[PDB]
């Protein structure tokens, strides 16, 4: 069958911009994952000297992830959300490629760098821009649903130095593995994603930036109920009293929770004691903000707008648009992946 006009077809093929004609990226892979492959790339035509990131989406064709990430980034524009510069569709092999400005850094690498051994100004400034970006996303009816340090990019040297960029809309959703960042309502079977779910993830990231450890670290283990991840959360937070989370009774897995757990097991456990062992003062404005983000009952969790208004951000030092604050960036640049 020939469904397309021949003249139209040759014309399109003559004029099509091809990723491999525009960009040099062979042997320049810097990331590999379930998302697909990320490359650091330069324009072949030398018309500028900028670094670009190229994401070859996992799989072939227009999957649900490719579809979401294209559809949403096509619309979104905020200094704290990664900008979709261009989409290349490769017809021969049905690969989809996305083009972004290259972000040298990300929170995963930054936090690891510190743990292998975090300035408070930078911590605050990071948090402020994450909230800024998530608020924008929320105000535009988008839930991210996979916030984690690997998805929080930070721009290196250049005209956006120290700027946070939220990335990976692969799981994002209009609302109108590793479970360290997963809100407890999800672990208890809540069927809907909500804004409050993103906010919990941001509290997890904030704790990790304060201490250099993932607050709900847990080893790897289908259904939404994850026993050991819940156990780790109660060990840090305490087991919620009935008055802390009245709707806990309505969670599909509540009776499983009642079967597997006794609250008495966690009577000396609280966020205060945890953060104290890791040198964060229960007194601090930092701590009080953290406790509002990491509230077990999602309806009692603060919103991003209210979090941005928190007096923590009015306390010295003020958050800066460059999270590195004119200081020298000690973090290593991403390495090229040369493996098979």
């Amino acid at each position: 069958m020939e469904f397309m006009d021949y003249d139209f077809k040759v014309k399109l093929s003559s004029e099509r911009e091809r990723v491999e004609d525009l960009f040099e990226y062979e042997g320049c892979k810097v990331g590999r994952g379930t998302y697909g492959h990320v490359y650091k790339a330069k324009r072949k035509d030398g018309k500028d000297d900028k670094d670009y990131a190229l994401k070859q989406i996992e799989g072939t064709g227009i999957s649900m992830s490719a579809c979401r990430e294209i559809a949403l980034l096509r619309e979104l524009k905020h200094p704290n959300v990664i900008s979709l510069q261009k989409v290349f569709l490769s017809h021969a092999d049905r690969k989809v490629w996305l083009l972004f400005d290259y972000a040298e850094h990300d929170l995963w690498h930054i936090i690891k760098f510190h743990r292998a051994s975090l300035p408070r100004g930078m911590v605050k400034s990071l948090l402020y821009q994450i909230l800024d970006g998530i608020h924008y996303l929320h105000a535009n009816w988008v839930l991210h649903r996979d916030l984690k340090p690997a998805n929080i990019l930070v721009m290196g040297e250049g005209p956006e130095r120290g700027r946070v960029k939220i990335a990976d809309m692969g799981f994002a959703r209009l609302f109108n593995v590793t479970f360290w960042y997963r809100a407890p309502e999800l672990l208890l079977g809540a069927r809907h994603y909500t804004k409050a779910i993103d906010i919990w993830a941001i509290g997890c990231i904030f704790a990790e930036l304060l201490t250099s450890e993932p607050i709900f670290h847990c080893r790897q283990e289908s259904n939404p109920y994850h026993h050991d991840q819940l156990d780790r959360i109660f060990n840090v937070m305490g087991f919620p009293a009935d008055k802390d989370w009245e709707d806990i009774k309505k969670m599909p897995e509540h009776s499983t929770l009642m079967k597997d757990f006794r609250r008495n097991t966690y009577t000396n456990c609280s966020l205060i004691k945890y953060m104290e062992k890791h040198k964060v003062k229960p007194d601090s404005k930092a701590f009080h903000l953290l406790q509002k983000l990491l509230t077990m009952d999602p309806i009692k969790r603060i919103t991003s707008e209210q979090a941005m208004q928190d007096p923590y951000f009015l306390e010295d030092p003020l958050p800066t648009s460059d999270v590195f604050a004119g200081c020298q960036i000690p973090y290593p640049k991403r390495e090229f992946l040369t493996e098979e």
Binding site: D5, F8, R74, E75
Partner: protein, 263 residues
Amino acid sequence: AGNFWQSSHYLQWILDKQDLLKERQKDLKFLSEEEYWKLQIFFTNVIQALGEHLKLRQQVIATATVYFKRFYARYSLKSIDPVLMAPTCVFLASKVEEFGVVSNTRLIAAATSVLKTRFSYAFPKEFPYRMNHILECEFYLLELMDCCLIVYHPYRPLLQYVQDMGQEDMLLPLAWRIVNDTYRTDLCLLYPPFMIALACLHVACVVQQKDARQWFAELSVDMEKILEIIRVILKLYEQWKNFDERKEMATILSKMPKPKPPP
């Protein structure tokens, strides 16, 4: 996402009427204006029927319909066979609108059965395309719309308006049905969705002899623009009366420019 004034819909896909007519000239060597409009109605109905068979919600259908219209607003009827484009649009719209990916077997069975069953007056032969065609067509459709996928429709603002009026029960079913009817026109390429919804609600008030001049007069909106839309809607009902799709479409399809084969 959720600000229309910053959307790709508004900034790239609200078009000038004259430029639209200018671009349609390619195809009017073959067809009168009347007949080109009839073809557009015809394929809107094909898309509606495809979505009904697949049990897709009005929003997916509407999104598919906008894709189809945007495509032929820029490109000729012969560029890609619209028979393949219609189901391709439905396929892509199901993904964007979060229903998911319609299966190979289900999409092709839907296209096959809908045309045989509800459109045999226009299509004597069976749906000839397979999933490998849909997939290739989908790639071209995505690039050729410059990857614009989020579409605003008049349903949401209409619901907000009738609620505000305190007349949901009374006026909604008719105004809603009129919004559906606007997909038979180019309105979605020409006006903000909230203006389409106001015009539809206005015609619903007039038909139901409900007075709302006050509620209407205290909206901060260009009433000239609403009236232009109202006229298109009145005109579409006159055309609906005069148009017999089952009797006319085979003749109109054979006049339609077909794709040139390879040399």
